[PDB]
Amino acid sequence: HLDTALVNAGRRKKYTQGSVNSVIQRASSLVFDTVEAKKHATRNRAKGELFYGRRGTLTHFSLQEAMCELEGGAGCALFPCGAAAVANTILAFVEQGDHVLMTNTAYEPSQDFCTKILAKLGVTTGWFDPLIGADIANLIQPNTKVVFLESPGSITMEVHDVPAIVAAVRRVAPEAIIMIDNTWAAGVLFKALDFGIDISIQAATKYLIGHSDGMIGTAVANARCWEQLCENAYLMGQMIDADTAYMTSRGLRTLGVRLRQHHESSLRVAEWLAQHPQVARVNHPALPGSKGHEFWKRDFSGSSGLFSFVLNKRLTDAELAAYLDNFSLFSMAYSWGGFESLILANQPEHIAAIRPEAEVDFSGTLIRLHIGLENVDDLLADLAAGFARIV
Amino acid sequence: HLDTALVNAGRRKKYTQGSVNSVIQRASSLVFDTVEAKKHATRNRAKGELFYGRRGTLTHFSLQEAMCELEGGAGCALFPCGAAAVANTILAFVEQGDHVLMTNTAYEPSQDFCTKILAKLGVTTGWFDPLIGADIANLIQPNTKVVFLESPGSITMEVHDVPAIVAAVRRVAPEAIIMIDNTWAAGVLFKALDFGIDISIQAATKYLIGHSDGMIGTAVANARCWEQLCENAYLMGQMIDADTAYMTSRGLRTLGVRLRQHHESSLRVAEWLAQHPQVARVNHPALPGSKGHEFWKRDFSGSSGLFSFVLNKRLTDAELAAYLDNFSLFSMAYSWGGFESLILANQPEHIAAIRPEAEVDFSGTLIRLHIGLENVDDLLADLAAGFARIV
Amino acid sequence: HLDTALVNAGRRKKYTQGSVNSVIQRASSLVFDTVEAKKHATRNRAKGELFYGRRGTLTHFSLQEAMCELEGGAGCALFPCGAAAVANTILAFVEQGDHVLMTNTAYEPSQDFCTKILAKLGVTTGWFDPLIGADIANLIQPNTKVVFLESPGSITMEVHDVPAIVAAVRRVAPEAIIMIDNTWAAGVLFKALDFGIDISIQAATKYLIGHSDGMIGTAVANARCWEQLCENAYLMGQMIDADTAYMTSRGLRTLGVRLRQHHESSLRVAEWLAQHPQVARVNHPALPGSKGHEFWKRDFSGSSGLFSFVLNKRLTDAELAAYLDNFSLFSMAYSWGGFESLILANQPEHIAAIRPEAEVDFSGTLIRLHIGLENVDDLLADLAAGFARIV
Amino acid sequence: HLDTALVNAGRRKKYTQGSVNSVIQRASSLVFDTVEAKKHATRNRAKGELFYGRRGTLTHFSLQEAMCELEGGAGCALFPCGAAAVANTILAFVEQGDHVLMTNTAYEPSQDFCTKILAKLGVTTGWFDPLIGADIANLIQPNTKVVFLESPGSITMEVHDVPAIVAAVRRVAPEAIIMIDNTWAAGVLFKALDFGIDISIQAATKYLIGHSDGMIGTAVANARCWEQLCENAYLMGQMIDADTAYMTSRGLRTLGVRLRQHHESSLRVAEWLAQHPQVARVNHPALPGSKGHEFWKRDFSGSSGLFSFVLNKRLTDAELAAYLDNFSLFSMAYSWGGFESLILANQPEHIAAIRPEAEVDFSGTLIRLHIGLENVDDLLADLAAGFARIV
Ligand SMILES: Cc1ncc(COP(=O)(O)O)c(C=O)c1O
Ligand SMILES: Cc1ncc(COP(=O)(O)O)c(C=O)c1O
Ligand SMILES: Cc1ncc(COP(=O)(O)O)c(C=O)c1O
Ligand SMILES: Cc1ncc(COP(=O)(O)O)c(C=O)c1O
Ligand SMILES: [Cl-]
Ligand SMILES: [Cl-]
Ligand SMILES: [Mg+2]
Ligand SMILES: [Mg+2]
Ligand SMILES: [Mg+2]
Ligand SMILES: [Mg+2]
Ligand SMILES: [Mg+2]
Ligand SMILES: [Mg+2]
C-alpha cells in the first residue's frame, strides 16, 4: 500500500547503517582507497557509487531511490528548489530553434523562465488552454520538442485531461518530451509516468518537506529521458545539499497521513464556500463543477489542500486590507504544502497578465487558500469572520 | 585588517539577534503581517527584505553582506555549488549569437558547460593561453560578450597577467563582461574587482567551507553587472540552503589562519619538490620560476595550498597503483580546500584533452597536491615514501 | 482545538522573525550591547531574556512556551533525553533522608536511577502496584518526598487511577511532589497538571520528535514546583541543543494527525490479537478489558500506538529468531513513537526482574508493538505470517 | 605530530563511509537485523556497537575515539555541556559520607554544584588555594574521595603545580579520584592523564567547537575509572546530540592552527598590558611573573587566548559603561574559545564571593579578555581607545 511504501522507500541498510533514517553524509570530496576503486567509482558516478559530492552522497542516493520507487521512474535528479527543477529540466531538452508548448496556467516563474531566458536562447514558447485535451495536436509544430503540463494549474486549479493530451502528442510527435509540474499531487496522488508523461517535476519544497522550512526540486524521468536529464542538469551544476535531501526523505514518512487531512479539511472548506452567499465560484479539483473535476476524479487517488475561490465582488484596496490583515489563523505568505493555513489574493487582471494569449472568465477578487492541519471548524470560523469584514 | 574583516563581516544584530553568528532561518514561506508589509517586501525582494525563501532568509542576507564586503562588490548571488555558479553566471550574460572567450586552463566542467550546453543554445566559445596577456586583444570578436579568466589555472596552475588582459579587453570591448573563477584565492588573496574584473566567482565548497563537507557557489558582481546577474540567476532558480549559507559564513571566521598555514606548508613542499631528483617541474604560483609567478607576487597577497608537479617519468599503470594506493596521509579524492591533504594524478594526454587548441609541454605524470593542515614534516615523509615506491 | 494549538504553539514573531517556524539560534556566548542590557539579562536569565546558551536561545524559549501552553504549566525544563529528564527531575526534589515512592511499572532506567544512584546518596525508594489507587496512602512514609507515576506503565501498559492516587497523596502528604512520566500520551492525551500532578515528564524522543532521529527530555512543572526544578536541573548542567529543540517544536505540528493514525491502527491490531488463538492477553489502554482501561476511557482524550500482548507460550530462542528475524515490516529496535512499526520481545522472567516487590501473572513471551504509519492491513498480514512461523 | 593527529583522529572508514568527515547518524532507535545481532549489540552496548541512541551512534563513536587518542584515555563520556560534564563526573564518584577537595579557583558553577547539590546529598566539600602544591596533603581527610583541579584557574588564571599536588595525593590517599577541568588547554596543551590525573574534563563548548555555536562536555578517563564514569553518567541520562558531536570532531581539525594564533596574539596583548600605566596586574599563564607561570612553562605545550588583567582603579558604574559599551571589536559575552574577542568585567568583591576560604589581593576592576582571531594590532587599538575613555 502507498502508506507502507512511503514509510519504507529508500531506507536500506547501505544508507541507514543501522538507524531508522538514512545517515547524513556531508561531502564534496569522496575518498578512493585505490586506483581501481577510483576507476570503478568513475564508471558508476551516475549509478550509485560514491564519486564526488556534486553527484551525491549516500543521503542523496537514498532520496533518489525513494523518489524513483514512489513515482515509478528510472532516475531522479535533484535541484536547489522547484523553480530550478522546472527551469533546468526544460533546458536539458531544448536547443536553439526548438519550440515548447506550455499550459497557460503554468506557475508564473515557469512562464517567466520561458519568456525571459529561453527566448533569448532561440527557443520559442507557445501556450494552450488547460482543457484543450485532444485538440493540442493542432498546436504541435515540426520543431515542438517539449510539452509542459501542470495539473491542477497554478492558482486557478484547472485539471488537464492527461490521457487525451498524451495520446494526441504521441500521434503527431511521439518523440516529444512531455513534462508535468506534479507538485500539487506531491508526485503520489497522480502517477504521471504511468500516464505516458516522460518527466514528473516537483517543488519538494511543498508537501514533501511539509513544514515550510526547506527548499528542493526533484525531477523523476522514465528510462528514455533519464540520461539526458541527469547529465545536462549536472552540467548546470544542479544539486541539493545532503541535509535537505535527508529532510525530504523524512517528509515522505508522514506524507500520507498529512495529505489525507489536507484533503478532508480542504474539501470541507470548499463545500462550505460553494454554498456561501459571498462566493461566486470555488476552484477545487475535488469539488464537483470545478474545471477538470471529471479528470481529477478519474485520474487521481486523492487531493491535497491548496485551492482557490472567487468572491462575489471585486474588493477595493481598503476592503483587501480589512479582509487580509485581520485573519487569526490564516497567514499571508507565498508557497504552500505545510502544516499552516495560508491566504493570498489576486485581482482578475493580475491573473489575466499571467494567462498568455488568453482572458480570465471572472471579475471578482480571487482568494487562494492553503488548508493546513488546524482544526477545520476553527478555520471556517476564521473565514466567516473575514466574510463579515467585507460583507 | 583582513583578519578582523573576516571575523566580523556580515555579523550585525539584525542577523544574529544576540548570538555571535547569524541565526539559521529555514524558510520557503515568509509571512507578511499586512498587505502594506507585503507590498514593501515585494518592492525590496532583491534588497534585503524578507520576501520568499528562494530570494533568501536572514541567514543568506548575512552571507551576501559578508561576501560583498570582502570582495568589494555590489551584490553576491548564491548557487548550489561552484559549477552551478560558473554555468549560471556565464548564462546570465549571454544570448544566442554571442561569443565567450575562455582561458584554456579553465576548470574542466566550466569548459564542458561551454562546449556541451552553450553551443547548442547558439553561443560559441573560443580559447586563449593563460599567459597571453595583452595579446588577447587580437582574439576579441565583434560578438565577444564574456571574457572568462581563471588564475591560477586548474591543475597546471598558470597565473594570468590580469592587468594586461583587462586593459587589452577594455581597449577593444569596453563593455565586455569580464569574469574570473577566483576559487584558489578564496576571493581574498586576489581582489578581482579592484583589477577591473566585473564578476568574481567562487566554489565556496573549497576554502570558504574549509572542511570538505558543504557545497556552494558564489558570484560577487560590480554595480554595472549586479542586476542582470541577480535576476537571471533567480529565473534559473539558483539558491543555496540556509544551513550551508551559515556554514560558509562560519568558514570565513577561520579562513585567514587556515590560508596562512596552507601557504606556509605548500610553499615548503613545493621548494622541497623543486630540489628532488625525481621531479621534473613544480607548478606552484608562489615558487620562483613557475608560470606567471611574477604576476602572483605582484597581484596576490598570499597563496593557498593547491599546486601540482611533474614527475621525471611517465608512470606505468602498475607504478601508478604502487604510488597512489600506499600513501598514509594523502588521500585520493576530487576537490580541495579542506583540512586534509589530497593527491591525484594525470597523464600528459589527459591534460592535453582539456587544453583546447593547445598542446601540453611535459611528458611525465602530473601529480596534483592539496596541502592541508597536517604537520608538514609528516607530509614530506609521506611524499618521500611515495618516491621510494617508484624510484 | 488541540490541532490548532499544536500548529501555533510557541510561534510568535519574536522567535520566528518572519518564517513559519522559529529561527535556529546556535549559541554559547550571547552578546550584550551594553552594561545595562547585561544587567537586565542577568536579572531575567531564567525569565526568557537572552543570557547564556546553557539557559537557552530563542529556539529553546519558543519550545518552552509551546510546552507550557500545551501541558498547562508554569515552566518547561529541557534535558538531553528522557532518561536525563526523569533522573534530574527526581534529583531536583530529594535530599539525603528522603523517600521516593515509585510505580513498579516504571521504565527500567528510571528504577535503576533510584536503586543505583539515589540509594547511595541516602534516598530510599519504595514501590507500588499501578492499580493501587486510593490504597497508596498506606505506603506513604513521613519522609516520602516524591510520588512517581507512569501511566500507562512501561511494557505492560497498566493505566493508573490518577484521581484516586492524587487524592490519597494529598490527604496524607499534601506537600509531596507528584510526578508522572507522561511519554505515552505525548503530554497531550492526558493533561497531567489538570489532575493535580505537579510535574509532567516526557521523553520528547518518542512522539514529539516523531521520526526516531532526535533525543530530548522535557519536564513541565506547575507554579509551586517550577523554580526548584529549573534551578536544580540547571546546576546539573541540563540542557538540549538548539537544533533538537527546533525539531521538537516542528514535531508538534504533525502530532495530532500522527496520533490519530497510531490510535486507529493500533486499536485495530489490538482487537484482532484479542480474538487470536495464539494470544493469551492484550495490553492496550484503549482495549476494553485491559488493565485500567476504565481510567483511560475516563481520563484520556485518545491513545497512541504503543502496546503489548502475551503469546500462548514462552518462546525458545530458536522460536524467537524464527519469529522476529523474518518480519517484512516490523523492525526490532528500542524506543518508539516514530513512523515505523517496531517489535520487541520480553520473557516473563525478564519482566519479573523489573517489577520490584511484585510478581508477574503470565508465563508466555510478551511482545511489545509500536504501530507506525504503515497500512494496517499490511501490518496485520506481517503479524499473521509471524504467528505461522511459531504455531 | 599533534597537527597530523588532530586532522586524523577518529576518521576511519567505519565512521566516514567514504567522506572526509564522519557521517551524521541521527537516532534513538537502532535497528537489529536479527536476534543474534541484537544479542551482540547488547553485550557490546558500551564497547562501540550500535545499540541505542542514548549510548551513541557512529558519529558519537568517532568523536569518542578521537578524544581518547588525543587525551590518552580509556574512554570518553559525553554530556550536554561542560557544566553537565563537571557535575556528573563528580557525582559519578561520590556517595553519602564522602568529601570533595576542590580548588578555590574552580569555575563558579562547579563550586555551586558542590555547595548546593552535593551538600544536601551528604557529600561535603573543602577548598584549597591553587598554589598549595605539596601542602595539599594536610587538607586530605580519611573520607576525601575526589580531588578536583582546574589549571589555569577560572578568571584569575593561576596555574597549579600538578606534579606536586598529584604526588601528595598519592602519598596520603592513593585511591582518590583526581579530576581536572582542562578546558583552557583544550585537553591538548596539558596532557592531564600523563600527569597521573584520573579524569580530564572539558567544556568542548570552548576551543573544541571553536565558533561559539555549540555546547558539549567531555570527560576522558583512565582505565581505572572509566567503567564507573561511563555507567554512572549513563544512569543520569547524559549524552550529546549527534550533530554537536560531529561539530566537535570538525573543530578538532583546525584546533592547532587556531590555538597557535590565540597564543601569539594573547601573549602580545598581555606583554603590552604588563607595561601599561593603567594596568595593575596581568594574569596570563604564558607571561613571566604570572602566578604559576613556571609550572605552565614546564608542564604545558602552549597557551590558549583567555587571560585577565586588573585595572589601576575600581570603575564606577558610569566608567564601566563608558569603557565596556564602546568597544568596536571586543564583545561582551560569557564563555570563550571562539574566533571573536570577548571582554567581561568583575569587581573584586565579586571574585571574593567565589574564592571560598581565601581572600582577594587586588582592589581594581578585573577585566577578562578572550583574544580571538582578529588582527592583533586592531585589538590593541581597541583596548587603547578603551583606556582613553577611563583615563
Ligand atoms: C506549482 C509550483 N511549482 C514550482 C514552484 C517553485 O518551487 P520553489 O519555490 O521551491 O522554487 C511552486 C512555488 O510556489 C509551485 O507552486
Ligand atoms: C577552480 C574550480 N572551480 C569550480 C569548481 C566546482 O566547484 P563544485 O565542486 O562546488 O561544483 C572546482 C572543483 O574542484 C574548482 O576547482
Ligand atoms: C516511558 C519512557 N520514559 C523514558 C524513556 C527514555 O527516553 P530517552 O531514551 O530519550 O532517554 C523511554 C525510553 O524508551 C520511555 O519509553
Ligand atoms: C573552565 C570552564 N569549565 C566549564 C564551563 C562550562 O561549560 P558549558 O558552558 O559548556 O556548560 C566553562 C564556562 O565558561 C568554563 O569556563
Ligand atoms: Cl517525434
Ligand atoms: Cl563593448
Ligand atoms: Mg568512493
Ligand atoms: Mg497560524
Ligand atoms: Mg588523512
Ligand atoms: Mg520497515
Ligand atoms: Mg545613576
Ligand atoms: Mg566583533
PDB file of C-alpha atoms in Angstrom, chain D residues 38-185:
ATOM      1  CA  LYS D  38      20.635  -7.764  19.000  1.00  0.00           C
ATOM      2  CA  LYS D  39      22.410 -10.036  21.498  1.00  0.00           C
ATOM      3  CA  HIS D  40      25.824  -8.987  20.198  1.00  0.00           C
ATOM      4  CA  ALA D  41      24.856  -5.311  20.362  1.00  0.00           C
ATOM      5  CA  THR D  42      23.552  -5.723  23.917  1.00  0.00           C
ATOM      6  CA  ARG D  43      26.734  -7.435  25.117  1.00  0.00           C
ATOM      7  CA  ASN D  44      28.751  -4.622  23.484  1.00  0.00           C
ATOM      8  CA  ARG D  45      26.436  -1.688  24.177  1.00  0.00           C
ATOM      9  CA  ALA D  46      29.249   0.256  25.930  1.00  0.00           C
ATOM     10  CA  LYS D  47      32.005  -1.021  23.596  1.00  0.00           C
ATOM     11  CA  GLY D  48      31.243   0.608  20.273  1.00  0.00           C
ATOM     12  CA  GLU D  49      28.427  -1.475  18.822  1.00  0.00           C
ATOM     13  CA  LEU D  50      25.205   0.235  17.783  1.00  0.00           C
ATOM     14  CA  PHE D  51      22.600  -0.409  20.463  1.00  0.00           C
ATOM     15  CA  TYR D  52      20.556   2.681  21.348  1.00  0.00           C
ATOM     16  CA  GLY D  53      20.942   6.378  20.675  1.00  0.00           C
ATOM     17  CA  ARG D  54      21.431   7.212  24.372  1.00  0.00           C
ATOM     18  CA  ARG D  55      24.664   5.179  24.206  1.00  0.00           C
ATOM     19  CA  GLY D  56      25.548   6.782  20.860  1.00  0.00           C
ATOM     20  CA  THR D  57      25.642   6.383  17.108  1.00  0.00           C
ATOM     21  CA  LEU D  58      28.585   6.154  14.707  1.00  0.00           C
ATOM     22  CA  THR D  59      29.006   9.924  14.982  1.00  0.00           C
ATOM     23  CA  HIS D  60      29.497   9.789  18.733  1.00  0.00           C
ATOM     24  CA  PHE D  61      31.795   6.771  18.495  1.00  0.00           C
ATOM     25  CA  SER D  62      34.065   8.672  16.100  1.00  0.00           C
ATOM     26  CA  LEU D  63      34.320  11.653  18.471  1.00  0.00           C
ATOM     27  CA  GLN D  64      34.922   9.393  21.465  1.00  0.00           C
ATOM     28  CA  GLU D  65      37.732   7.623  19.632  1.00  0.00           C
ATOM     29  CA  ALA D  66      39.306  10.964  18.709  1.00  0.00           C
ATOM     30  CA  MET D  67      39.127  12.259  22.284  1.00  0.00           C
ATOM     31  CA  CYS D  68      40.623   9.080  23.735  1.00  0.00           C
ATOM     32  CA  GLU D  69      43.515   9.245  21.265  1.00  0.00           C
ATOM     33  CA  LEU D  70      44.209  12.929  21.813  1.00  0.00           C
ATOM     34  CA  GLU D  71      43.978  12.822  25.621  1.00  0.00           C
ATOM     35  CA  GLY D  72      45.415   9.303  26.047  1.00  0.00           C
ATOM     36  CA  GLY D  73      42.361   7.874  27.793  1.00  0.00           C
ATOM     37  CA  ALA D  74      40.496   4.590  28.005  1.00  0.00           C
ATOM     38  CA  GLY D  75      37.081   6.116  27.360  1.00  0.00           C
ATOM     39  CA  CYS D  76      35.348   9.428  26.725  1.00  0.00           C
ATOM     40  CA  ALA D  77      31.900  10.225  28.173  1.00  0.00           C
ATOM     41  CA  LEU D  78      29.769  12.907  26.507  1.00  0.00           C
ATOM     42  CA  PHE D  79      27.470  15.475  28.102  1.00  0.00           C
ATOM     43  CA  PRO D  80      25.110  18.294  27.049  1.00  0.00           C
ATOM     44  CA  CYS D  81      27.603  20.964  28.162  1.00  0.00           C
ATOM     45  CA  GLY D  82      30.746  21.471  30.205  1.00  0.00           C
ATOM     46  CA  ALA D  83      28.830  22.153  33.417  1.00  0.00           C
ATOM     47  CA  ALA D  84      26.971  18.865  32.998  1.00  0.00           C
ATOM     48  CA  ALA D  85      30.290  17.092  32.477  1.00  0.00           C
ATOM     49  CA  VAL D  86      31.720  18.569  35.679  1.00  0.00           C
ATOM     50  CA  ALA D  87      28.638  17.938  37.793  1.00  0.00           C
ATOM     51  CA  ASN D  88      28.012  14.424  36.535  1.00  0.00           C
ATOM     52  CA  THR D  89      31.659  13.349  36.584  1.00  0.00           C
ATOM     53  CA  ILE D  90      31.945  14.349  40.247  1.00  0.00           C
ATOM     54  CA  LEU D  91      28.575  12.781  41.040  1.00  0.00           C
ATOM     55  CA  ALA D  92      29.641   9.524  39.372  1.00  0.00           C
ATOM     56  CA  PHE D  93      32.361   9.000  42.008  1.00  0.00           C
ATOM     57  CA  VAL D  94      30.753  10.122  45.290  1.00  0.00           C
ATOM     58  CA  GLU D  95      28.292   8.696  47.789  1.00  0.00           C
ATOM     59  CA  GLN D  96      26.903   9.956  51.065  1.00  0.00           C
ATOM     60  CA  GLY D  97      29.697  10.341  53.592  1.00  0.00           C
ATOM     61  CA  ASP D  98      32.348  11.283  51.053  1.00  0.00           C
ATOM     62  CA  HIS D  99      34.378  14.514  50.861  1.00  0.00           C
ATOM     63  CA  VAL D 100      35.434  16.505  47.785  1.00  0.00           C
ATOM     64  CA  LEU D 101      38.524  18.731  47.853  1.00  0.00           C
ATOM     65  CA  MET D 102      38.303  21.384  45.132  1.00  0.00           C
ATOM     66  CA  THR D 103      40.498  24.291  44.091  1.00  0.00           C
ATOM     67  CA  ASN D 104      39.011  27.625  45.227  1.00  0.00           C
ATOM     68  CA  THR D 105      39.623  28.916  41.670  1.00  0.00           C
ATOM     69  CA  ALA D 106      37.181  26.422  40.178  1.00  0.00           C
ATOM     70  CA  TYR D 107      34.577  27.714  37.751  1.00  0.00           C
ATOM     71  CA  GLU D 108      31.699  29.091  39.786  1.00  0.00           C
ATOM     72  CA  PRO D 109      29.021  26.626  38.545  1.00  0.00           C
ATOM     73  CA  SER D 110      31.349  23.785  39.582  1.00  0.00           C
ATOM     74  CA  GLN D 111      31.545  25.254  43.084  1.00  0.00           C
ATOM     75  CA  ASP D 112      27.784  25.764  43.211  1.00  0.00           C
ATOM     76  CA  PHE D 113      27.136  22.176  42.175  1.00  0.00           C
ATOM     77  CA  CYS D 114      29.189  21.114  45.180  1.00  0.00           C
ATOM     78  CA  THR D 115      27.685  23.529  47.713  1.00  0.00           C
ATOM     79  CA  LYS D 116      24.053  23.416  46.539  1.00  0.00           C
ATOM     80  CA  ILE D 117      23.627  19.870  45.198  1.00  0.00           C
ATOM     81  CA  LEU D 118      26.271  17.654  46.831  1.00  0.00           C
ATOM     82  CA  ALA D 119      25.857  19.165  50.296  1.00  0.00           C
ATOM     83  CA  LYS D 120      22.222  18.128  50.607  1.00  0.00           C
ATOM     84  CA  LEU D 121      23.126  14.565  49.492  1.00  0.00           C
ATOM     85  CA  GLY D 122      25.607  14.002  52.310  1.00  0.00           C
ATOM     86  CA  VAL D 123      28.777  14.906  50.401  1.00  0.00           C
ATOM     87  CA  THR D 124      30.929  17.669  51.881  1.00  0.00           C
ATOM     88  CA  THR D 125      33.360  19.916  50.026  1.00  0.00           C
ATOM     89  CA  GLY D 126      36.561  21.586  51.159  1.00  0.00           C
ATOM     90  CA  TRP D 127      38.792  24.022  49.332  1.00  0.00           C
ATOM     91  CA  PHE D 128      42.438  24.660  48.540  1.00  0.00           C
ATOM     92  CA  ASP D 129      44.488  27.564  47.204  1.00  0.00           C
ATOM     93  CA  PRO D 130      45.683  26.935  43.634  1.00  0.00           C
ATOM     94  CA  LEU D 131      49.382  27.279  44.570  1.00  0.00           C
ATOM     95  CA  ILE D 132      49.167  24.888  47.535  1.00  0.00           C
ATOM     96  CA  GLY D 133      51.293  22.244  45.798  1.00  0.00           C
ATOM     97  CA  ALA D 134      52.612  19.541  48.115  1.00  0.00           C
ATOM     98  CA  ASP D 135      50.869  21.051  51.153  1.00  0.00           C
ATOM     99  CA  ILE D 136      47.532  19.775  49.865  1.00  0.00           C
ATOM    100  CA  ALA D 137      48.323  16.624  51.852  1.00  0.00           C
ATOM    101  CA  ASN D 138      47.280  18.357  55.090  1.00  0.00           C
ATOM    102  CA  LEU D 139      43.791  19.006  53.725  1.00  0.00           C
ATOM    103  CA  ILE D 140      43.056  15.420  52.683  1.00  0.00           C
ATOM    104  CA  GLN D 141      40.613  13.723  55.049  1.00  0.00           C
ATOM    105  CA  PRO D 142      40.022   9.996  55.545  1.00  0.00           C
ATOM    106  CA  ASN D 143      36.797  10.360  53.559  1.00  0.00           C
ATOM    107  CA  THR D 144      38.234  12.502  50.735  1.00  0.00           C
ATOM    108  CA  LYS D 145      37.150  10.692  47.576  1.00  0.00           C
ATOM    109  CA  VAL D 146      37.677  13.301  44.849  1.00  0.00           C
ATOM    110  CA  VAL D 147      40.358  15.944  44.388  1.00  0.00           C
ATOM    111  CA  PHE D 148      39.272  18.469  41.762  1.00  0.00           C
ATOM    112  CA  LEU D 149      41.804  20.635  39.936  1.00  0.00           C
ATOM    113  CA  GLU D 150      41.401  23.451  37.444  1.00  0.00           C
ATOM    114  CA  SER D 151      44.595  24.783  35.893  1.00  0.00           C
ATOM    115  CA  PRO D 152      44.687  27.652  34.917  1.00  0.00           C
ATOM    116  CA  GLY D 153      42.013  28.724  37.373  1.00  0.00           C
ATOM    117  CA  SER D 154      38.807  30.356  36.231  1.00  0.00           C
ATOM    118  CA  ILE D 155      39.041  34.138  35.773  1.00  0.00           C
ATOM    119  CA  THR D 156      42.234  34.687  37.799  1.00  0.00           C
ATOM    120  CA  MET D 157      44.308  32.190  35.774  1.00  0.00           C
ATOM    121  CA  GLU D 158      46.547  30.669  38.496  1.00  0.00           C
ATOM    122  CA  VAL D 159      48.397  27.556  37.284  1.00  0.00           C
ATOM    123  CA  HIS D 160      48.636  24.613  39.685  1.00  0.00           C
ATOM    124  CA  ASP D 161      51.829  22.621  40.334  1.00  0.00           C
ATOM    125  CA  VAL D 162      50.125  19.416  39.211  1.00  0.00           C
ATOM    126  CA  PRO D 163      53.132  17.092  39.768  1.00  0.00           C
ATOM    127  CA  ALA D 164      53.381  18.259  43.375  1.00  0.00           C
ATOM    128  CA  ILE D 165      49.645  18.011  44.021  1.00  0.00           C
ATOM    129  CA  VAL D 166      49.344  14.550  42.476  1.00  0.00           C
ATOM    130  CA  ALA D 167      52.375  13.187  44.335  1.00  0.00           C
ATOM    131  CA  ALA D 168      50.967  14.439  47.655  1.00  0.00           C
ATOM    132  CA  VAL D 169      47.521  12.981  46.974  1.00  0.00           C
ATOM    133  CA  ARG D 170      49.003   9.610  46.034  1.00  0.00           C
ATOM    134  CA  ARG D 171      51.184   9.553  49.182  1.00  0.00           C
ATOM    135  CA  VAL D 172      48.211  10.080  51.523  1.00  0.00           C
ATOM    136  CA  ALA D 173      45.189   8.839  49.528  1.00  0.00           C
ATOM    137  CA  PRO D 174      46.393   6.755  46.564  1.00  0.00           C
ATOM    138  CA  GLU D 175      42.853   5.565  45.748  1.00  0.00           C
ATOM    139  CA  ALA D 176      41.415   9.077  45.427  1.00  0.00           C
ATOM    140  CA  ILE D 177      39.893  10.137  42.112  1.00  0.00           C
ATOM    141  CA  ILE D 178      41.854  13.123  40.817  1.00  0.00           C
ATOM    142  CA  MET D 179      39.957  15.151  38.239  1.00  0.00           C
ATOM    143  CA  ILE D 180      40.793  18.310  36.299  1.00  0.00           C
ATOM    144  CA  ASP D 181      38.772  20.846  34.327  1.00  0.00           C
ATOM    145  CA  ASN D 182      41.212  21.100  31.415  1.00  0.00           C
ATOM    146  CA  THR D 183      39.126  23.399  29.209  1.00  0.00           C
ATOM    147  CA  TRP D 184      41.679  26.216  28.928  1.00  0.00           C
ATOM    148  CA  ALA D 185      44.235  23.816  27.442  1.00  0.00           C
TER     149      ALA D 185
END
